[PDB]
Structures are given as C-alpha cells and as structure tokens.
Design a protein around this ligand. Structure first.
Ligand SMILES: Cc1cc(N2CC[C@@](C#N)(C3(C)CC3)C2=O)cc(C(=O)NCc2cc(F)cc(-c3cnn(C)c3)c2)n1
Ligand SMILES: Cc1cc(N2CC[C@@](C#N)(C3(C)CC3)C2=O)cc(C(=O)NCc2cc(F)cc(-c3cnn(C)c3)c2)n1
Ligand SMILES: O=C(C[C@H]1NCCC[C@@H]1O)Cn1cnc2cc(Br)c(Cl)cc2c1=O
Ligand SMILES: O=C(C[C@H]1NCCC[C@@H]1O)Cn1cnc2cc(Br)c(Cl)cc2c1=O
Ligand SMILES: [Br-]
Ligand SMILES: [Br-]
Ligand SMILES: [Ca+2]
Ligand SMILES: [Ca+2]
Ligand SMILES: [Cl-]
Ligand SMILES: [Cl-]
Ligand SMILES: [Cl-]
Lengths: 479, 480
C-alpha cells in the first residue's frame, strides 16, 4: 500500500504508486522499465480508440524496419549497432528514434501522380532515445511505445486540416479517455520541430510540481522534407509539385500523466472508460457463513452486469482475505468495488464504493446495471472536471516580467502577451533559470500559444521586451 | 503483371508476386523489408483473433525492453549495441532474439507462493536474428514480428494442458483465418528447443519446392529454466518447489506461407476472412458524370451494413481492365464490375478471384450472395490446399523409397525408432546423396514432426532406417 503523500513528496509517491499498483517493474538496464499487464490494459484501450478513429480517416497501419543506415541518417543520441555476435558490421546501423529517414525514401518511390494522394500511414512501434540522464517512468524513458503518423497531400490546406483533425483526436485521447484536461496550442519557432512549417501540440500541467509537459504533437511539415527526399507528384495539368506532409505522435507518457492527474494518497485512480476491471466483486467469506450462496449470487451479478457491457471481475481467489482484496483493488484503482457478504443476502442489496471519492451506496440487485452505468459516467466526468479546474487554477494571467518569479514559486504557469521574437524566449529562459539558482530545471520556457486566445487590448506590450505584443503565450517550467 | 509461373520459376514468382502486389518494399539493409498496408492488415486480423482467444484463456499482455546485458544474455546472431552517439557503452547490450532472459528474472521475483500461479503473460513485438544467410521475405528475415507467450504453472499437467490449448489456437490461426492446412506434431529430441522438455509444432508444406516449414511452436519447458533462473514457489504445505513453464510463438512467416499456399500464376489470392478489402468495386469509366460513381457509393454503404470490407477504385486515368489486373494481382477475393449496362438492368457482375467464375446479381440480392460466396471461397481455398498437402506425403517403409520421393518434391511418412543418432545420420546421408545426384538451398532431409495422429503401428514393424523396432511414424522431408 502507498505510504508517501502526493503533496508532500511527489517523487517517492509516484514511484510507489506505479510500483505498488503493479504497473511497472524495474530493469537492470537504466532508462528502460517493464510495463506489467495492469498498465498495458490501459495502453491497449487508448490504442484501440485512436486506431479506430484514424482508420475512420483512411489512415492505414504498416510496419517499417527498426534499423536505419548511417549514410541515410546523416543526410547525436541515436543508438548504434556495430556487431552481430562477434563480427563487426561493415557499416554501423542505428536504431530508430523516429522513422522519417526510413519511410520517406519509400514515399519518394511510391508517389508519382495526384491519384496516389493523399498518402496516410500510421505505425505502432517502439523507439529509442538514449539520453544519458535520469529517467522518469512513463514520462521520460530511453525506450518507449508510441504511434506515429505520416501523411503526404497534394495541397497544404488538406495537410493542415488533417493536422488539426489529428490533434483533435489527441485531445479526445486525453480528455475523453484518460480524463486529463489539455491545452491545444502551437509551438514557438524556437520550440517547434525544425524543418516543419508549424508544430501543434496538446499540453498538460502537473500541479504537484508546477511543471508543464507536452502530451502529443502534430506537425505541419509542409514541403521541406519533400525537397529533401524528392517526393514529387504530377498534378492534373502535368506539372511536378512537391507534396505537403504532416506527421504526428503520441506515446505511453500518457499513462504517466494519468497517474499524476487522478492518483491520490491511497494509490491509483483509473478513469472507467479505460478501466479493464470497472467493477470488482469481492465475496466476503468467513467461518463458512453462506459461502455457497455468496458465490452463487456473485456469479449471477457478474452475468447481469456483463449483459450491460460493464467489465466485471469477481475476486474469488481463496488465498486472500477480503480486506487484502479491498486494499489490492484500491491501490490499483478499480473504479467501483462491490462487496457482497451474508447480511446482504437477505437485504436484496449490495454495497458499492467508488474509488475517486470513497462514498458508499446500498443498491438493489435489480437496480445494479443502470445505477453502475450512472456512477461510472459520474466518476468519469468528475475525475475530468476536478482535473480541469486544477489546471485552470494553476495558470496566472500576467502583464509584466515582475509577476513571473512569484508565479513560478506558487508552482504555476503564466499566460502573458508576447511579441514572438525567438531570441527573447532564450533571454527569458536564461534570466529565469539564474533567478531560480538564487535559492530538476529552474528555467522557464514557452509551452504553447493557445488556440483559444483571450482578448488582446490594442497597444498591449510584450511582457518582457515591451515591444508590441502579438499573441498570448503560455510559459512555465517544463518536463 | 506477374511474368513468372508459380511452379516453373517459384523464386521469381514469389518475389514478383509480393512486390507487384504492393505487399513489401525492399530496403537498403540486407535482411529487412518494409511491410505495406496490404499485408499488415492481415497481420492486424490474425493478431486480433489470437489476442482475443488468449485473453479468453486468462493470458494478459505486457511489454518488456528490447535490450539485454551480455551478462544476462550469456549465462552469433545477436545484434550488439556498442555506442550511443560516439561514446562507447560500459557494457555492450543486445537486441533480443527472444525474451526468456529478459522475462524469467522478473518471473523469479514475482512468484513466491502457489497464490501467484498460474502466471500467464504475452507480448507482441519484434526480434532480431542477425544471420549472414540469404533472407527470404516473410519466411526468414533478420527482423520480424511475432508474439511470444510465456507462462508458469504449479503442475506439469496444467502446463501441458495450456501447451496443447495454444497449439490448437495456432491450428485455428492457420486454418480458420489463413485457410492454410497444417499438421500438429512433436519435435524429435534433436529438433526440440534445448533446455525445453518437449517441443510441439504445427508444420506446413510448400509443393513447389516440396519443402516443409515450421509454422508455430509451443514448448513444455518443464523446470530447467526454473532452476536456471531460480523461479520457485512454496506450496500449501510450505515446501519450496520449481515451476513448470511453457513458451510459444508465431511470426509474420505465417503470411509468406499463406501467399505460397494460395497464389496462382496471376498473383496472390487472399482469403475473405483476412483480406484487407473483401470486394473491390470497379467502375467502368474512361468522362465521369452520368453518376456511375453515385450508384457505387450506394452499393458501398449497402454492403458495409453487412460488415463487408469494400473499396471503390475510382482512380481517374486507369483503364477498367488495368484495374481488373491490378486487383487480380493483389488478390481481392471478389470483384464487382459496374458499367452503364449494369446500371440499365439493376444488376452487377461479380467475379470471384479463386475460380474466375462470374455471377450476375440484382442489386437487392447483393449483400447476402456475396456472404454466401466469401464463405464458399474461404472453404474452397482451404480444401484444395488440404488435398495438395495429402498428395505431397508418401507413406513409406524403406529408405530406398526415400530419395525417389524427394525428387518428386514430396514428404515421407516413415516409421522411425526415435533415437536422435539416426536422425543425424539420415540427414548427412541424404545430403550427400543429393550431391551425387547433383554432379550430373540444400538437400538435407530432416524430421519435420512426429505427428500427433499416428496411423496403426503393427507389431514387429522395423524403423525404415535403423531396422530396430519402430516406435512412431514420423514426417520427414526437406526443410526451410
Ligand atoms: C516517454 C518519452 C516521451 C517523450 N515525448 C517527447 C515529446 C512527445 C510528446 N508529446 C512525443 C514523442 C509524442 C511526441 C513525448 O511523449 C520524450 C521522451 C524522452 O525524451 N526520452 C529520452 C530520455 C531518457 C531519459 F532517461 C531521460 C531523459 C531526460 C531527463 N532530463 N531530460 C531533460 C530528459 C530523456 N520519453
Ligand atoms: C521470419 C522468421 C521466422 C523464423 N521462424 C523459426 C521458427 C519459427 C516458427 N514456427 C518461430 C520463431 C515461431 C517459432 C519461425 O517463424 C525464423 C527466422 C530466421 O531464422 N531469421 C533469421 C534469418 C535471417 C536471414 F537473412 C536468413 C536466414 C536463413 C537462411 N537460411 N537459413 C537456414 C536461415 C535466417 N525468421
Ligand atoms: O521525431 C520527431 C518528429 C515527429 N516524428 C513523428 C512522430 C512525432 C514526432 O514529433 C522529432 N525528433 C525528436 N527527437 C529526435 C531524436 C533523435 Br536521436 C533524432 Cl536523430 C531525431 C529526432 C526527431 O526528429
Ligand atoms: O526462441 C526460442 C524459444 C522460444 N522463445 C519464446 C517464443 C517461442 C520460441 O520458440 C529458441 N531460440 C531460437 N533462436 C534463438 C536465436 C538467438 Br540469436 C538466441 Cl540468443 C536465442 C535463440 C533461442 O532461444
Ligand atoms: Br518528439
Ligand atoms: Br524459434
Ligand atoms: Ca476538420
Ligand atoms: Ca495551487
Ligand atoms: Cl482493448
Ligand atoms: Cl452455503
Ligand atoms: Cl462501459
């Protein structure tokens, strides 16, 4: 069970939560962890939703090799294979950190005419970024699972609308499945993906350590990579034009984020929409009191709730006390826990405890399926809405730079008018980092320029340079 | 179009077929190939089938790192990571070729009491087996996708029952989804997984080189790994015992097999159950308004409501007949032709890809009859294959009848004594008999499997080689 406290020592709390809930297991190679079934259930669920939604868009899944030649890569932190067994490769090959240098030549080969567009591929794989720093399970790891999508189109308007559609699917992944609120915005030109035209992004906020984290990203690559890799088509009139590319990505970091958003001092709290066990049925057995009837009814209740597509498990393992089972499913975060013991056998009801709030209900057996649907909807919405309020309580609207340092001290982000000069963002990072040193990184940086822009009074000056401000920008310490 | 002929030039036919089908793209690193959507949808299909069945058996999914210490790996085809950027690494690390050494330490840590058993885990991933031999797409490659399942049980009976259940799921994977017939059997103690106690397998046959190929595998590991890694539990009486483990896998080789099992001189054929598109609607077009396309879209929704997978090929500059050949090569089980004649009679022309038989169907009658055909197709494809299979097996009793059989690209079902010595001697002698034939891919014949279904073994029957008392019948032939 979890001993540490979320608002007192976040780091050890998080470690305990993930470990005690059986989601991860440590490994002798630093930077890689093991994803036990409990976490992978959740992953499977969001992968299913994203997959169905992108298949609805014509995107098709595929698989490109893990390996890229050195020649075709330096056309850093990439991992190099030099030997098989005991013989060295004639050329070292690297392991993929992202798949552009692998797929894009194939794109060059496959695209000749307008009729071959759009071209929309996704792939669900593992990548390797071997930064020699300190990892954070889910959040920052040397190997991780993601999906990545790459499309090429005949026009930039098409590409751009797909960028937006995909980032909307990413908003739904987080807010709608994992109950984590996020912010849609656009990356600064010092933070955007280089040689993309424009990066869009969903951002999240960890209040317990006042930090920003990127959740997913969708790039408008435009035509830079087409020039690079010579991906041309012939339009209707017979002209050779460059294609307009997008790519987009989202990883298991999402599970990390969800743990921090909903976790509490007893452990995990798993939003029902992604819960593999939404309801655990715990038979209360002691002194051979009514065990045959208790199990009879528990299995009947299971078939009842399964008819309503509630995902139900009866914890009838003989070698565990009920109280151990309670703590087990609590630390694990099963949304709803249903207790049936011999005294309920004559009541015709049963006791239901919701994990998020701990409230208890006495519900009839006939009334179980619909009331449990209802509670799960309410848990899902309320997980989300409490999180969304914490998010917006953590953001401060400022006018001048004087307001920054107090705000970061309250573990908050700042929304400020900005002129969007790239060198000013770096001046800002350095200034704030040094001020932080007068007492994990202390520097503050841009997170995104929110799509949702609040009102911009005329003659608003950039909070740092005093120049005329162009857009509100979200800044904060980061992950 | 596919220039090669399937049984005349099998090699060129095979690569011609998988390339012009758009199933693979080649790559600038030997051993690796790009798996394109037309093929990956099939991998998606069988992965869903099998994932659901093992989820029904209580098996859960997980993910383990792709790297091993040399320390843990060594306790010649392994890909070794040495550097990041330009700095060496303290210790080189290896890309997994399988994940026993990655998982069993964790297992040893997670299992302490009978409470914790059985432990059932699976994972979908890829592995690297960097062999310096000539790869073959799908069939033998340097990086390939698979699933490896690893369980641990209290008793050998539970372990064994699980082994056989998984091998039956592999049977269904090939026969029910892939329409590919296979044979369940047991591996000779020479062909079994070392440090395993018994290996079971499903084998497959390729008529055009008479070659046998292992299709899936399911291992009774017993307790050897349990001693290696110290995976132990305490029973209800408090005594400390070793776990009996199983492991089992299957790869994208299953797709190559499928190709080779059903392809014809025209190209691929894909069983309806796993085909990406089940029906291609070909508009007969050359311009376009007059709404043939509208009617196509109507048909498309009518057919999706029966859960059929449909694609309208409305590409502008291609010819109807070019489209016919295109989807012919790809292997779409059913082609729906719509032109102005069909619009004027409310009928459609449907051509099944297996036999080429055509059918005229009114638009109303469309969705049911297609369902009746796909199923027919799915049965037909599997049945023909089955027959070809049984025609490539010769039951023999002497070694003399062996080398005739191999020349016909057949497999032998001979009575054997089962000491591995004899297997080794047969392999060497058959190879050099192949070479003395060749004075005028190797010729070595080995044990494919010891089939589970054993025809009657009369008393006094002598092994077809040693001449000692035969124990069981065994399937031999050349291998992949
Ligand atoms: C899981 C994951 C996820 C992500 N990202 C990046 C953006 C993205 C989003 N949205 C993607 C990829 C989806 C678009 C996402 O999820 C990044 C990393 C990572 O960069 N790992 C390497 C590493 C290892 C390590 F041991 C330590 C560090 C480390 C320590 N201090 N600092 C400053 C770094 C870094 N990892
Ligand atoms: C896709 C796949 C599949 C399989 N197998 C093996 C058994 C199994 C089955 N059933 C599994 C794993 C499921 C249990 C299966 O599918 C083996 C290989 C392979 O051995 N790859 C390396 C390699 C590279 C290479 F360039 C050439 C060769 C090569 C050339 N001649 N010879 C003798 C080898 C080998 N690859
Ligand atoms: O990987 C990207 C861009 C996009 N690729 C598709 C999925 C979503 C993703 O944002 C940016 N990026 C990020 N990290 C990298 C690390 C290394 Br190592 C290399 Cl060489 C290259 C990269 C690199 O290109
Ligand atoms: O891979 C196996 C045994 C089983 N692993 C689990 C999935 C099913 C599979 O049959 C045997 N084997 C086969 N090929 C290997 C290649 C290399 Br390289 C290494 Cl190090 C090890 C091995 C190795 O152990
Ligand atoms: Br990234
Ligand atoms: Br193997
Ligand atoms: Ca849109
Ligand atoms: Ca606060
Ligand atoms: Cl799922
Ligand atoms: Cl009773
Ligand atoms: Cl539900």
């Amino acid at each position: 069970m979890v001993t540490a406290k979320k608002d007192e020592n976040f780091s050890e709390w998080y470690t305990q939560a993930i470990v005690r809930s059986e989601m991860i297991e440590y490994y002798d190679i630093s930077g890689c962890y093991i994803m036990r079934p409990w976490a992978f259930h959740i992953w499977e669920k969001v992968q299913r939703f994203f997959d169905d939604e992108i298949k609805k868009m014509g995107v098709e899944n595929s698989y490109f090799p893990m390996f890229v030649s050195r020649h075709k890569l330096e056309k850093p932190e990439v991992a190099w294979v030099t030997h098989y067994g005991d013989s060295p490769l004639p050329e070292k090959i690297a392991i993929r950190p992202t798949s552009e240098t692998i797929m894009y030549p194939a794109y060059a080969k496959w695209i000749r005419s307008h009729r071959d567009l759009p071209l929309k591929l996704n792939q669900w794989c593992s990548v390797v970024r071997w930064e020699f720093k300190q990892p954070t399970p889910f959040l920052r790891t040397r190997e991780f699972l993601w999906q990545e999508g790459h499309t090429a189109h005949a026009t930039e308007e098409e590409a751009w609308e797909l960028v937006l559609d995909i980032l909307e699917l990413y908003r739904r992944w987080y807010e709608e499945c994992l109950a984590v609120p996020v912010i849609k915005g656009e990356k600064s030109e010092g933070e955007k993906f280089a040689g993309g035209k424009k990066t869009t992004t969903v951002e999240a906020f960890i209040p317990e350590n006042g930090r920003g984290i990127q959740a997913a990203t969708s790039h408008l690559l435009g035509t830079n990579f087409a020039k690079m890799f010579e991906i041309e088509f012939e339009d209707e009139e017979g002209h050779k034009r460059l294609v307009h590319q997008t790519s987009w990505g989202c990883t298991t970091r999402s599970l990390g984020v969800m743990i921090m958003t909903h976790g509490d001092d007893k452990g995990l709290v798993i939003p029902p929409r992604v819960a593999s066990v939404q309801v655990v049925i715990i038979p209360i057995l002691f002194k051979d009191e009514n065990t045959g009837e208790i199990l009879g009814k528990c299995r009947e209740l299971k078939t009842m709730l399964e008819k309503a597509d509630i995902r139900v498990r009866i914890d009838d393992r003989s070698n565990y006390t009920p109280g151990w089972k309670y703590n087990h499913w609590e630390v694990k975060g099963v949304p709803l826990r249903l207790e049936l013991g011999p005294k309920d056998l004559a009541k015709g009801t049963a006791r239901v405890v919701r994990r998020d709030t701990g409230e208890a209900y006495q519900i009839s057996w006939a009334d179980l399926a619909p009331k449990l649907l209802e509670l799960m909807e309410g848990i899902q919405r309320s997980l989300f809405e409490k999180a969304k309020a914490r998010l917006h309580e953590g953001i401060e609207k400022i006018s001048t730079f004087d307001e920054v340092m107090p705000a970061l001290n309250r573990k908050h982000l700042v929304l400020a008018p900005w002129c969007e000069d790239p060198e000013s963002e770096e001046q800002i990072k350095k200034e704030t980092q040094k001020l932080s040193e007068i007492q994990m990184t202390g520097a503050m940086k841009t997170l995104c320029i929110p799509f949702d822009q609040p009102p911009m009074p005329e003659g608003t000056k950039c909070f740092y340079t005093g120049k005329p401000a162009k857009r509100w920008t979200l800044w904060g310490r980061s992950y």
